[PDB]
Design a protein around this ligand. Structure first.
Ligand SMILES: NCCOB(c1ccccc1)c1ccc(Br)cc1
Ligand SMILES: NCCOB(c1ccccc1)c1ccc(Br)cc1
Lengths: 592, 592
């Protein structure tokens, strides 16, 4: 494994440190042992340890400014030495001094002429979930993350480039967005803006990420609220202060679906970051999406909903009024227990009341392909397999198979179970369907593994008990599978329970079913209690916040496929008004 | 829309401000730019901006006492200039100085001779839910709302009229009732009472609203407790202090149903304000309604309840003993599955045991019209459609239609479901029926939309599965609608479940019903969890408070329609005792 290789090399280093006396005296900061190894007896002052480190590299891991100076005064070429290992390919002696906030060592490494543009492209400096931190590649980025504002400026003094981007195309600003101490990263974010060129164009706040992300837009996708609140102060204008009233005018540029994507909205609903869902609830955005929904958002969702309501009640009207036949097969020639009345009409006659079905069968197929023409959570897979069964039934039609009902049946449940997708929004039943959305595709697929276990023990028992018994009277368990289906129903107490009192029940049924009734309830009562984990107070706020999440998500969906002769752009643009042509939304509020 | 017009005009103003250099220097407070535009080069000092504003109006929005003075020293006619726009029709320069608490500018606008009676009848000053604040029309009202007691008195010094009413007939006192800072509005409420005429008649606390509402009575309907507690100190008298005992004597005038309405009680239960329900729980009122119910309130509600109990068990006794006939229609001439035994007797014979039914049918119709004679929450619509079905059944009688049972049946459930209305009060089952009152008319009408969706997908499936099958044995789904009714019951597991083991179940029933059983439970279990939102601790207090709400509501109902030879007036009047003829209720309490 990889998690053990670094554990071993961290120990193989200590071996070579313990083995190499130069690296040892540099670790133990033994001043009276380096000169015994560098001046009297000239040892290998360029000693590469296990991790390709030098004596100065070891003298920097542990703040040994003495051992560092001894190695820089007896061999001033060790400062320019980078780590020559795989785990630290790029790290130098200045990196460790800036990380350790060794100001007097950064001040001394810079007085020695260290490089302020050395990238630390080692594998331990990467952005991985198994790595604990991530500060970047450039030493200025490290000073920016540790908070040592004295070192941040001290690196700029010696020619540090803020425009310098790492391998991920991240400036020093983007790195400050992925840090915990947001309340102190703001003061460091502003300190890094004061060294800009001072021009309104090619600004550092406008240098986008390699994934097309400005430092302002990244704070929204990552869930960073404090930096999103701090970055908003740079892009908002206040109009007037009328006592408690303050009508502020927000910029609303990258926070708008203007670019095809190139929108903060289209990035909050699409990310899997749970913290990001709190960003559309911020005061510059919440006034947008609340006005994007109170008008022209809610009625259009009711238009597509009502259309799909009628498109589904039409498909059902074509199934209750479909071809008929009093069964052309002779009789019950196979098995006598045959309730078969095949209803297949290959012909296109019946024109009186079938010409109404002719156009009806034509609408459901042109709508099914229209459903697929606009496609080339869980409610997304229900609508696509619905129209898939429509074309397969059209294939079972014109071929008229005896299984002409199995493909036609799946389209009934999927047509309506996808019309409860419109409960998302509309009224307050939205969080109810987002609650079952976590249930159908969360616990159910895991809870059934425990119920099938209980059924496959009792169903296989009730079959052997009534295998000796005659299935004519009390034949709940007769087939191999139907013995399980009756046990499945009996696990839900839908059936009366195999209660035949005229016959003599076998001695093992009156014993096994009692054991099934208790355990079936103890798995039902323990399932009801298992749902109480989402009841304290935040979970009512989480799903209501997640309902508003999928509410704003659907709101942005309709803005892209609908035309533009309706549904205007958010706010008011900057033309015919002394503005910068960018949008703006006038939101006045009141304090206390 | 209207919410965008103000957004545009707020930007069209900034254009004309940016365009007009006079309005611009007045905004930027550029003293060295107004004299360049008023004295050297005489610009249009009366420059009407986009919002009909003057340079002084702009010099007042932002506290620019310099720019204001420059415009009032070079053109002293701008003080009398009101806003000539539609959004601010009436606002002047003094309005903005009082709102901004610009004491030295109010002191200067008043030294310039500004008007202290200018109404600000603009559309943005109206009492609307989309407007953020509401302070009134008169400048004294604005000083009263902002709290600047130095400006409140400074306006009275220059002839401010407290008796001045706005368009809504509201004095300065009524405006202080609709403010958040109640704990500081009290000190401002008292400051505005000290400038009254000093006479006990035509007092400002007695100037009613245009809707017949004194400032004391408004605090109760609005839910304002702190001003209701503060206004009570002016109308209560203490009798004696016996150590911890303090027998206080409350006024009880407008807090009584003396006037036809002209009562604080009749206004708390009728308003939709949830905060107002906390007012009948106040210590001057709670002692009233608790004594209005412990005697003569509870027994009379038991009288009308017992009367309606017997009036309903009588209507049911007339249906179980109604006309009879062994069915005059030939046989089962239509369809053989006909269980019909029509019971229609158009004749008025049968006098032995029917003369008991004759008067019985006469009581239910004279009571049904009596129910309507006293009419010319949800429990209000149950009693009226009940008596409506009584008259329609009387119309189906004397005409003897074959649907003589459909109108007679609706009156059975409505007669009893309206006798559980008497659970409101009586004992502690009141909050149980006010809980189902929010359920029958709250979530049910919304939750059924999601269950019909699930049923209309599976019911329409189980019909096509058993359309090929013979409905003789396992005919749960045979008709177009009955296939849905059986699925509806199966959604509630009332039915055994289509469990026929003698026949061979179709391959698609043994698959679709399993999918129905799980999803039917996952919509049932997710409905049970959805009821937990009313369980933390305040919701048990909210419905118990709402139960007491509908308890006090019913208490005031009986006081109006009942006669006066019983049920005396609250408290003891002020005659034969040295009192003011107004109630009073002697309520002694104990401190600690
Ligand atoms: N192009 C398919 C339309 O998208 B939809 C959609 C619309 C109607 C029926 C089913 C799916 C969608 C929207 C938000 C989420 Br989350 C998931 C699906
Ligand atoms: N005039 C009808 C009598 O009023 B009632 C009423 C009395 C008996 C049966 C049904 C209604 C009423 C009282 C309070 C509320 Br809240 C709603 C209805």
């Amino acid at each position: 494994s990889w998690a053990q290789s670094r554990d071993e090399q961290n120990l193989l280093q200590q071996k070579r440190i313990w083995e190499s006396p130069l690296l040892l005296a540099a670790k133990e900061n033994n001043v009276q042992a380096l000169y015994k190894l560098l001046k009297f007896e000239g040892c290998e002052v360029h000693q590469k340890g296990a991790m390709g480190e030098t004596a100065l590299h070891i003298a920097a891991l542990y703040d040994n400014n003495e051992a560092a100076q001894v190695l820089m005064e007896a061999a001033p070429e060790l400062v320019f030495e980078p780590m020559t290992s795989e785990l630290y390919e790029g790290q130098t002696a200045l990196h460790i001094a800036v990380i350790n906030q060794n100001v007097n060592l950064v001040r001394a490494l810079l007085a020695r002429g260290a490089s302020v543009s050395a990238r630390a492209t080692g594998s331990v400096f990467h952005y991985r979930p198994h790595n604990l931190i991530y500060y970047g590649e450039h030493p200025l980025s490290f000073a920016a993350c540790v908070g040592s504002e004295e070192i941040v400026r001290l690196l700029i003094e010696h020619g540090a480039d803020i425009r310098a981007q790492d391998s991920l195309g991240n400036t020093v600003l983007h790195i400050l967005i992925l840090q915990p101490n947001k309340t102190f990263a703001c003061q460091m974010y502003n300190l890094l803006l004061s060294y800009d060129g001072g021009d309104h164009l090619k600004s550092l706040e406008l240098v986008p990420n390699n994934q097309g992300l400005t430092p302002f837009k990244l704070a929204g996708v990552e869930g960073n609220i404090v930096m999103f609140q701090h970055l908003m102060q740079k892009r908002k204008h206040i109009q007037w202060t009328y006592g408690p009233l303050t009508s502020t005018l927000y910029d609303l540029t990258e926070i708008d679906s203007s670019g095809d994507d190139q929108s903060l909205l289209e990035l909050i609903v699409t990310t899997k970051k749970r913290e990001a869902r709190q960003i559309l609830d911020q005061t510059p955005v919440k006034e947008l999406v609340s006005l994007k929904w109170k008008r022209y958002g809610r009625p259009y969702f009711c238009v597509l909903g009502a259309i799909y309501v009628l498109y589904i009640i039409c498909f059902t009207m074509c199934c209750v009024y479909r071809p008929l036949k009093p069964r052309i097969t002779n009789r019950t020639n196979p098995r006598d227990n045959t309730l078969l009345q095949q209803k297949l009409l290959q012909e296109a006659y019946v024109t009186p009341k079938d010409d109404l079905r002719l156009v009806g069968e034509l609408v459901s197929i042109v709508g099914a392909v229209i459903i697929l023409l606009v496609e080339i959570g869980p409610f997304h897979v229900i609508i696509v397999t619905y129209a898939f069964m429509v074309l397969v039934t059209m294939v079972m039609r014109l071929t008229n198979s005896d299984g002409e009902v199995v493909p036609m049946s799946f389209a009934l449940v999927l047509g309506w179970c996808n019309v409860m997708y419109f409960a998302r929004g509309f009224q307050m039943l939205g969080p109810f369907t987002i609650m079952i959305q976590k249930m159908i595709f969360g616990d159910l697929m895991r809870f059934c593994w425990l119920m099938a276990v209980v059924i496959l023990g009792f169903a296989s028992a009730f079959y052997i008990i009534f295998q000796t018994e005659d299935p004519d009277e009390l034949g709940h368990f007769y087939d191999y599978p139907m013995a399980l289906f009756s046990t499945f129903e009996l696990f839900l107490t839908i059936i009366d329970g195999p209660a035949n009192y005229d016959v003599d029940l076998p001695f093992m049924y009156s014993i096994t079913y009692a054991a099934f009734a208790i355990i079936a309830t103890l798995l039902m009562l323990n399932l009801l209690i298992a749902m109480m984990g989402d009841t304290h107070w935040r979970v009512a706020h989480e799903r209501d916040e997640l309902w508003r999440a999928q509410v704003v998500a659907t709101t942005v969906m309709l803005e892209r496929k609908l035309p533009r002769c309706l549904w205007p752009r958010s706010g008011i643009c900057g033309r015919e008004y002394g503005l910068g042509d960018r949008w703006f939304l006038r939101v006045e509020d009141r304090q206390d």
